[PDB]
Structure 1
Amino acid sequence: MPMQMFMQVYDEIQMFLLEELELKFDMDPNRVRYLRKMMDTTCLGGKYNRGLTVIDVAESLLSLSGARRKRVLHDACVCGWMIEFLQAHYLVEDDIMDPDVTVQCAINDGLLLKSWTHMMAMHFFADRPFLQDLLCRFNRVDYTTAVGQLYDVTSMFDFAEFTLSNYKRIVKYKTAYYTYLLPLVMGLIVSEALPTVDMGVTEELAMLMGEYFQVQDDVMDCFTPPERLGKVGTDIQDAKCSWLAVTFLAKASSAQVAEFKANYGSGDSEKVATVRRLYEEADLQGDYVAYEAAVAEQVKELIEKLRLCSPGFAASVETLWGKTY
């Protein structure tokens, strides 16, 4: 039912944006069909974790506060696709980093996807009292992610920034704000229950959940094989500021740091394997278990602090934090 409605609203969103181009933007059918295939390629395929999070938070606040139900759930789906389209916009910008018409179309696709988040919001929320509030929080969160991408890309140019606090800074701005905090806020906006929740505790929960999931992704990037991870682990080659790096540098000897610095960031298969051996010999995956446990217990505690003033809100977070575990 949640996914079946989310995909049905996608059809409603897509046919509006494409008809608007046809009727109000002088676009020819060939380019309309081209943009249909592009929209389906970049936006459809993922697990829709950010989009469905908005709907799961919205439906809890309705029955735990009737034509208002039909409107709030539809607004949640539009806000859900605003994030998914924004995610597609970020992914397209990532493809460019790694008279050529195929690169011009990639840049133009990234601009179109980002603009479509504004267009679907300005249309479906034209008579909603929160259109100005939603667009401002959406723009600021987008600005936050761009700042977070600067912290990550330049985390090795100016190993001084390989610290646990700067790692949190990267995860906070680059990932946590738009993946965890943004969908939760959108569930409170369409339900008209934003000032009824502790924003500080909700903020703190989003950063901790982002930290938990980013540490797990860093370990899986290095140790999970390609066929089981779904991609190729590239953090060691790209010299990223991963949780495995900042944890190793703290508990490594002066020689292990020298052997780490002389092999990190290289593309050579043997230098990358040398980095994995140091991670293995340092018992980092033993520290990974205890680190995620302490973070998980912080998530369990702050959910209780939020339910004293927002019971149904924490119920969605519990089911969303629980999920596949």
Structure 2
Amino acid sequence: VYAQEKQDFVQHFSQIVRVLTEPEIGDAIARLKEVLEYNAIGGKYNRGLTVVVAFRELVEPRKQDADSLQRAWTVGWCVELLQAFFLVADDIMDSSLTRRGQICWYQKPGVGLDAINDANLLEACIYRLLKLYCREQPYYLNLIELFLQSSYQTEIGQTLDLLTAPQGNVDLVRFTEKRYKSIVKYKTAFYSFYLPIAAAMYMAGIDGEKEHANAKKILLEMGEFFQIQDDYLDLFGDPSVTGKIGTDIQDNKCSWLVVQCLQRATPEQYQILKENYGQKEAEKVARVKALYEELDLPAVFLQYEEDSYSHIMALIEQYAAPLPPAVFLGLARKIYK
């Protein structure tokens, strides 16, 4: 329901940094603090908040002691660190300029490609926090394996993203709905909303294969919507709101936009896209955006967001039980705002 819930979560960031950043390695620990502060804050915090809210909804308060509550927000901060690790690396590989309303970490003079190792440290912080706070719990190994498998799935999706988007090479024939759906399932659906709810389910003692699979049915589809919205906003969103500049056209990406464009384009329009996509020149990028506008892709996206919301609601009705519907409804509220 709340942004009070969100402020409560964000208030724990200082404690997470503190415990991660306690003589010889001192200079390295300070750099770690600097990487956490720059890269783990400044977004919307929904993924990590979801662990806290879901956990509360799945466990009776007569079991939610101070230590249990702390484990929940710590694991929520683990999901945030996973996102941070991945975005630092992604921004390098995507040649991005800005993120979360500031220059990308690797663009800072003085950082550069050393951000590669800085990302690897954020990943390590997840397993440090799990050891510090969850090691005696019955779900500990489940949580470790969930984070590891989520990361491997995300990495497979990144591979697909990058292979389908070669620099210097036309790849329009590969830009199909079928390829699109596989890319986004792996690169986004597992780690965005499946991961945090699955984590909360484990923490609540819900470890059954069937209940995880039913939750997955809902949550992967939510994640696939989230990536389509991300692709729309790359070009049509306001960077003062999104906090980042889009690069998909210049990067030759298999975006939902280019897929939808190809589905509707005349042969003449196909040649316009072929001659202008996947190139650094601003005039060429502008020609693609004009094509997308001519083809009313912003309206196609509006219709898709309506159709998607209805579908996800129907999946909640099919697959939520025996979990409280509100577990999924509050996520849907935030995602489809």
Q: Same fold (TM over 0.5)?
A: yes
2:20 aligns with 17
1:52 aligns with 49
Encode CA deviations 1:13-55: one digit per residue, 9 max, x unaligned. Answer: 3333222xx5xxx423x44334323322221222211110101
- Counterpart residue type for residue 94 of structure 1: D
Q: Is this contact kept in 2: 1:51–1:79, CA < 8 A?
A: yes
Shift of 1:145: 0.7
Computing the radius of gyration from Cα coordinates, the structure with the larger value is 1
| Residues 67-146 of structure 1: pairs in structure 2 closer than 5 A | 67-97=63-93, 98=95, 102-103=111-112, 105-146=114-155
2:182 aligns with 169
Shift of 1:246: 0.8
1:318 aligns with 329
Q: Is this contact kept in 1: 2:218–2:319, CA < 8 A?
A: no
Shift of 1:197: 6.4
Shift of 1:119: 1.1
2:25 aligns with 27
Give unpaired runs (5+ residues) of structure 2. Answer: 96-108
Are residue 250 (structure 1) and residue 263 (structure 2) matched? yes
Cα gap change, 1:215/1:101 in structure 2, threshold over 3 Å: closer, same or farther?
closer
Q: Is this contact kept in 2: 1:86–1:113, CA < 8 A?
A: yes
Q: Is this contact kept in 1: 2:86–2:119, CA < 8 A?
A: yes
Shift of 1:63: 3.6
1:192 aligns with 205
2:5 aligns with 2
Q: Distance in 2 between matches of 1:107 and 1:233?
A: 21
- Choose which of 286, 310, 317 in structure 2 pairs with 1:273: 286
Q: Distance in 2 between matches of 1:31 and 1:62?
A: 39
Q: Distance in 2 between matches of 1:111 and 1:196?
A: 31
Shift of 1:115: 1.0
Are residue 152 (structure 1) and residue 149 (structure 2) matched? no
Shift of 1:160: 2.6
Q: Distance in 2 between matches of 1:59 and 1:135?
A: 21
Alignment RMSD: 2.3
Q: Is this contact kept in 1: 2:231–2:255, CA < 8 A?
A: yes
For the residue of structure 2 that corresponds to 1:238, the secondary structure is coil
Q: Distance in 1 between matches of 2:196 and 2:121?
A: 21
Greater shift in the superposed pair: 168-177 or 150-159: 150-159
Q: Distance in 1 between matches of 2:290 and 2:88?
A: 34
Runs in 1 of length 4+ with deviation above 4 angstroms? Answer: none
For the residue of structure 1 that corresponds to 2:59, the secondary structure is helix
Q: Distance in 2 between matches of 1:139 and 1:202?
A: 19
Q: Is this contact kept in 2: 1:197–1:306, CA < 8 A?
A: no
Shift of 1:229: 4.0
Are residue 230 (structure 1) and residue 226 (structure 2) matched? no
Shift of 1:8: 5.0
Cα gap change, 1:131/1:294 in structure 2, threshold over 3 Å: closer, same or farther?
same
Q: Is this contact kept in 2: 1:72–1:191, CA < 8 A?
A: no
Q: Is this contact kept in 2: 1:72–1:190, CA < 8 A?
A: no
Cα gap change, 1:52/1:11 in structure 2, threshold over 3 Å: closer, same or farther?
same
Greater shift in the superposed pair: 145-154 or 246-255: 246-255
TM, length-normalised to structure 2: 0.85
Shift of 1:164: 0.8
Encode CA deviations 1:117-173: one digit per residue, 9 max, x unaligned. Answer: 111112211101111111111101101111110111111349232111211111111
